[PDB]
Design an enzyme around this catalytic site. Sequence first.
Site, PDB file in Angstrom:
ATOM      1  N   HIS A 164       1.516   4.573  -2.923  1.00 54.64           N
ATOM      2  CA  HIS A 164       1.621   6.029  -2.731  1.00 54.64           C
ATOM      3  C   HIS A 164       2.922   6.581  -3.277  1.00 54.64           C
ATOM      4  CE1 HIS A 164      -1.967   6.436  -0.420  1.00 54.64           C
ATOM      5  NE2 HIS A 164      -1.514   5.846   0.673  1.00 54.64           N
ATOM      6  N   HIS A 206       0.829  -1.206   0.000  1.00 57.99           N
ATOM      7  CA  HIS A 206       0.000   0.000   0.000  1.00 57.99           C
ATOM      8  C   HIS A 206       0.868   1.262   0.000  1.00 57.99           C
ATOM      9  CE1 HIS A 206      -3.561   2.532   1.264  1.00 57.99           C
ATOM     10  NE2 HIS A 206      -2.594   3.222   1.851  1.00 57.99           N
ATOM     11  N   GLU A 207       1.883   1.335   0.869  1.00 56.89           N
ATOM     12  CA  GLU A 207       2.740   2.529   0.910  1.00 56.89           C
ATOM     13  C   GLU A 207       3.482   2.759  -0.404  1.00 56.89           C
ATOM     14  OE1 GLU A 207       2.456   4.600   3.304  1.00 56.89           O
ATOM     15  OE2 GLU A 207       0.998   3.163   4.138  1.00 56.89           O
ATOM     16  N   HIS A 221      -5.474   7.350  -2.278  1.00 59.62           N
ATOM     17  CA  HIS A 221      -6.397   6.325  -1.813  1.00 59.62           C
ATOM     18  C   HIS A 221      -7.539   6.091  -2.793  1.00 59.62           C
ATOM     19  CE1 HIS A 221      -4.962   7.079   2.549  1.00 59.62           C
ATOM     20  NE2 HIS A 221      -4.364   6.014   2.044  1.00 59.62           N
TER      21      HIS A 221
HETATM   22  C1  LIG Z   1      -5.231  -3.853   1.652  1.00 63.67           C
HETATM   23  O1  LIG Z   1      -3.982  -3.600   2.213  1.00 63.67           O
HETATM   24  C2  LIG Z   1      -3.800  -2.423   2.935  1.00 63.67           C
HETATM   25  C3  LIG Z   1      -2.791  -2.317   3.771  1.00 63.67           C
HETATM   26  C4  LIG Z   1      -2.608  -1.030   4.567  1.00 63.67           C
HETATM   27  C5  LIG Z   1      -3.435  -0.025   4.367  1.00 63.67           C
HETATM   28  C6  LIG Z   1      -3.276   1.231   5.201  1.00 63.67           C
HETATM   29  C7  LIG Z   1      -2.027   1.766   5.440  1.00 63.67           C
HETATM   30  C8  LIG Z   1      -1.885   2.857   6.271  1.00 63.67           C
HETATM   31  C9  LIG Z   1      -2.998   3.426   6.868  1.00 63.67           C
HETATM   32  S1  LIG Z   1      -2.840   4.821   7.997  1.00 63.67           S
HETATM   33  O2  LIG Z   1      -3.811   4.523   9.053  1.00 63.67           O
HETATM   34  O3  LIG Z   1      -1.498   4.908   8.575  1.00 63.67           O
HETATM   35  N1  LIG Z   1      -3.207   6.324   7.288  1.00 63.67           N
HETATM   36  O4  LIG Z   1      -4.405   6.277   6.575  1.00 63.67           O
HETATM   37  C10 LIG Z   1      -5.604   6.593   7.237  1.00 63.67           C
HETATM   38  C11 LIG Z   1      -5.597   8.044   7.725  1.00 63.67           C
HETATM   39  C12 LIG Z   1      -6.744   6.428   6.248  1.00 63.67           C
HETATM   40  C13 LIG Z   1      -2.118   6.861   6.482  1.00 63.67           C
HETATM   41  C14 LIG Z   1      -2.451   8.325   6.291  1.00 63.67           C
HETATM   42  C15 LIG Z   1      -1.239   9.025   5.713  1.00 63.67           C
HETATM   43  N2  LIG Z   1      -1.327   9.101   4.276  1.00 63.67           N
HETATM   44  C16 LIG Z   1      -2.435   9.598   3.480  1.00 63.67           C
HETATM   45  O5  LIG Z   1      -3.507   9.932   3.863  1.00 63.67           O
HETATM   46  C17 LIG Z   1      -2.004   9.617   2.034  1.00 63.67           C
HETATM   47  C18 LIG Z   1      -2.772  10.043   0.789  1.00 63.67           C
HETATM   48  C19 LIG Z   1      -2.174   9.981  -0.381  1.00 63.67           C
HETATM   49  C20 LIG Z   1      -0.731   9.494  -0.455  1.00 63.67           C
HETATM   50  C21 LIG Z   1      -0.068   9.128   0.610  1.00 63.67           C
HETATM   51  C22 LIG Z   1      -0.749   9.197   1.962  1.00 63.67           C
HETATM   52  C23 LIG Z   1      -0.247   8.848   3.354  1.00 63.67           C
HETATM   53  O6  LIG Z   1       0.840   8.436   3.628  1.00 63.67           O
HETATM   54  C24 LIG Z   1      -1.971   6.180   5.117  1.00 63.67           C
HETATM   55  O7  LIG Z   1      -2.814   6.273   4.282  1.00 63.67           O
HETATM   56  N3  LIG Z   1      -0.722   5.540   4.760  1.00 63.67           N
HETATM   57  O8  LIG Z   1      -0.662   4.903   3.524  1.00 63.67           O
HETATM   58  C25 LIG Z   1      -4.253   2.877   6.638  1.00 63.67           C
HETATM   59  C26 LIG Z   1      -4.391   1.782   5.811  1.00 63.67           C
HETATM   60  C27 LIG Z   1      -4.622  -0.171   3.426  1.00 63.67           C
HETATM   61  C28 LIG Z   1      -4.783  -1.274   2.739  1.00 63.67           C
HETATM   62 ZN   LIG Z   2      -2.520   5.187   2.509  1.00 61.33          ZN
END
Ligand SMILES: COc1ccc(-c2ccc(S(=O)(=O)N(OC(C)C)[C@H](CCN3C(=O)c4ccccc4C3=O)C(=O)NO)cc2)cc1
Ligand SMILES: [Zn+2]
Length: 158
Positions: A119, A115-116, A125
Amino acid sequence: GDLKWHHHNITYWIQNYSEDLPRAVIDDAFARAFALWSAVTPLTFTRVYSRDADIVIQFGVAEHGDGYPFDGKDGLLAHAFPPGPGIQGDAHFDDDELWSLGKGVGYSLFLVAAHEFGHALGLDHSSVPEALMYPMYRFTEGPPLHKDDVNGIRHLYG
Ligand SMILES: COc1ccc(-c2ccc(S(=O)(=O)N(OC(C)C)[C@H](CCN3C(=O)c4ccccc4C3=O)C(=O)NO)cc2)cc1
Ligand SMILES: [Zn+2]
Ligand SMILES: [Ca+2]
Ligand SMILES: [Ca+2]
Ligand SMILES: [Ca+2]
Ligand SMILES: [Zn+2]
């Protein structure tokens, strides 16, 4: 618009490690997560040992140096910056989380990294629930990429 890498040989540097998993297991989870995206883009991903790498990977807690602090256990898991110079393209993981791989407790490093890295290639998202880029962590044993993810990455890279 469409932030994207404008070269094909993407380099990455694992700047530091979590102790939650063997060094080799961490390397391989990252390698697998890149392998996901390699297959569906014109990009290659080469591990290097250099602060000049495109994607610098870091495990950190609280304020870890980019002014966007992590928040202890729960809440944030990881964050990454879209393509570009310096901090852009880099991927940080919150080491106040338990990092793991199997079904059970902790978060799959592989899945969160995939996922990261999405990005870090330019994907925002998704609104499609089953999607790797959907903003909800869920553990799976299934293939992570969804049509929407592949649609999205082809939108950027062809
Ligand atoms: C199916 O497999 C997966 C595995 C992991 C994830 C995932 C990863 C991180 C987060 S979070 O809670 O840290 N947080 O997100 C929350 C606030 C919704 C951070 C928020 C920080 N963030 C953004 O909102 C964002 C938006 C656009 C580009 C990059 C980013 C970014 O690093 C995140 O999205 N990291 O990837 C949540 C879910 C999803 C699907
Ligand atoms: Zn994310
Ligand atoms: Ca956290
Ligand atoms: Ca970078
Ligand atoms: Ca940890
Ligand atoms: Zn950070």
